[PDB]
């Protein structure tokens, strides 16, 4: 009695779970969500592309409930799906099934993403001086991501570029004498990970926050540190991050989109005297009409447009 397009959908759900190497209990939850989804007319009668992304949606909802750090972009890459089609289908099905879906777990994403960075062993592309301890890396990156969240750098942004910037800063700060000459682009390349476009901005924001924190400590404030010289004091700054963040807010610390120069415009006044019932003169309308000469010049121009 179960439809064919439904059977194909349920099979696709199980295959995606298996490919993603998800714990065994997730497959059953995701299958149940697709079945619950198919009971609604708008889903049953869904088109070719929405039917395909629906599989991914049900797997992502299941992952989000278990704090499995699967991003929307990563699921769309796997499925060769359009992010926007996935985006509208996800929002629709959550609303439809009346679910409260937990947000992406950042701590879980740091552990997973950071572990994929190929920096824990020396190779032709990774010199021995650039090799870092996995646990030291994860621990420092997690502290910098928590600092980014606390200092308004995470809210409204893509989460992965924050972790890229924080990983780089964690790595550099663990051996600063030899790693400050290496750029964010070179770091991603040796770690064999793609460079997200916003990672550069997140990096500069994170270095700016670490400088504001450095100003709360007398012995660091007298050093007149810059974005380059602050890197070797990151270990110290993270050790007292709770105290220094409390101190920095006490003395201005706002989301980066707020710290912008005010815009100068002359149409700010909203005063209008329009009633909607005023006379419409003939002269006011005639300016929107072509003259017989304009009509004739235009007609001639369109009479030669073909052959």
């Amino acid at each position: 009695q179960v439809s064919r397009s439904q059977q194909r959908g349920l099979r696709r759900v199980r295959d995606l779970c298996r490919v993603l190497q998800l714990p065994p209990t997730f497959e059953d939850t995701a299958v149940a969500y697709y079945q619950q989804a198919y009971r609604h007319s708008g889903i049953r009668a869904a088109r070719l592309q929405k039917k395909e992304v629906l599989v991914g949606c049900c797997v992502l909802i299941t992952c989000r409930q278990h704090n499995w750090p699967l991003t929307m972009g990563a699921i769309c890459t796997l499925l060769y799906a359009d992010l926007d089609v996935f985006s509208s289908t996800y929002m629709q099905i959550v609303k439809l099934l009346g679910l409260d879906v937990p947000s992406l777990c950042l701590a879980e994403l740091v552990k997973t993403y950071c572990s994929s960075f190929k920096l824990f062993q020396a190779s032709p592309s990774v010199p021995a001086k650039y090799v870092e301890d996995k646990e030291k890396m994860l621990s420092r990156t997690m502290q910098l991501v928590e600092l980014a969240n606390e200092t308004w750098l995470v809210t409204g942004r893509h989460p992965l570029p924050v972790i890229t910037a924080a990983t780089f800063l964690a790595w550099q700060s663990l051996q600063p004498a030899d790693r400050l000459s290496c750029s964010l682009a070179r770091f991603c390349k040796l770690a064999n990970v793609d460079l997200p476009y916003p990672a550069s901005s997140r990096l500069q924001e994170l270095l700016a926050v670490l400088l504001r924190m450095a100003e709360q400590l007398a012995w660091l404030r007298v050093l007149r540190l810059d974005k380059r010289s602050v890197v070797k004091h990151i270990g110290d700054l993270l050790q007292h991050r709770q105290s220094l963040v409390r101190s920095a807010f006490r003395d201005l610390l706002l989301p980066p989109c707020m710290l912008k120069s005010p815009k100068r415009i002359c149409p700010v006044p909203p005063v209008s005297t329009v009633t909607g019932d005023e006379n419409i003169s003939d002269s006011e309308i005639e300016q929107y009409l072509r003259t017989p000469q304009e009509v004739r010049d235009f007609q001639r121009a369109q009479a030669a447009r073909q052959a």
Binding site: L83, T155, G156, G276, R290, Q299
Partner: protein, 177 residues
């Protein structure tokens, strides 16, 4: 009250001109008409005052966008009707109706969107992987609000100006507290 009045940014209205229209004739004989029937079925028309855009269909139905007040929207829709009349069509002004109203303002303090999505979960949708704003679906009045970390708020879906004011007054203590 907050002491903050949301500013109207856009008004969408509709009107029936009560007669069938030849869009090729309008596109040819008007200066302010854009018509690409392979891209979109309607004539796109623009008037300078009130600065607006209209979508004129062969059925005689019209959509008027861009006005900053309901009065400006009515005045503009009436001017488009008059342009159609002078082009030779027996145009009327039937069933003028405001379809949508967009308001905007600033609470001038930052918003922890990650906290608001937890406390007001049943109304909130916040997915930073997709869009920077929290989508707040207020039930009374039936208004969608887009809430940004900056404290800037977009209010939309209103049929009357009072629903924009009512929704912002309801949201302000939620954002303040």
């Amino acid at each position: 009250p907050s002491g903050i009045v949301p500013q109207l940014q856009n008004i969408v209205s509709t009107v029936n001109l009560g007669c069938k229209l030849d869009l090729k004739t309008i596109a040819l004989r008007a200066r302010n008409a854009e018509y690409n029937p392979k891209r979109f079925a309607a004539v796109i028309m623009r008037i300078r005052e009130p600065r607006t855009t209209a979508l004129i269909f062969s059925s005689g139905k019209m959509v008027c966008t861009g006005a900053k007040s309901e009065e400006q929207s009515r005045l503009a829709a009436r001017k488009y009707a008059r342009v159609v009349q002078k082009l030779g069509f027996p145009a009327k002004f039937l069933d003028f109706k405001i379809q949508n109203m967009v308001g905007s303002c600033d609470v001038k303090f930052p918003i922890r969107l990650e906290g608001l999505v937890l406390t007001h979960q049943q109304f909130s949708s916040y997915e930073p992987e997709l869009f920077p704003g929290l989508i707040y679906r207020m039930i009374k009045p039936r208004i969608v609000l887009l809430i940004f970390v900056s404290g800037k708020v977009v209010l939309t879906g209103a049929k009357v100006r009072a629903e924009i004011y009512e929704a912002f007054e309801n949201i302000y203590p939620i954002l303040k507290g």
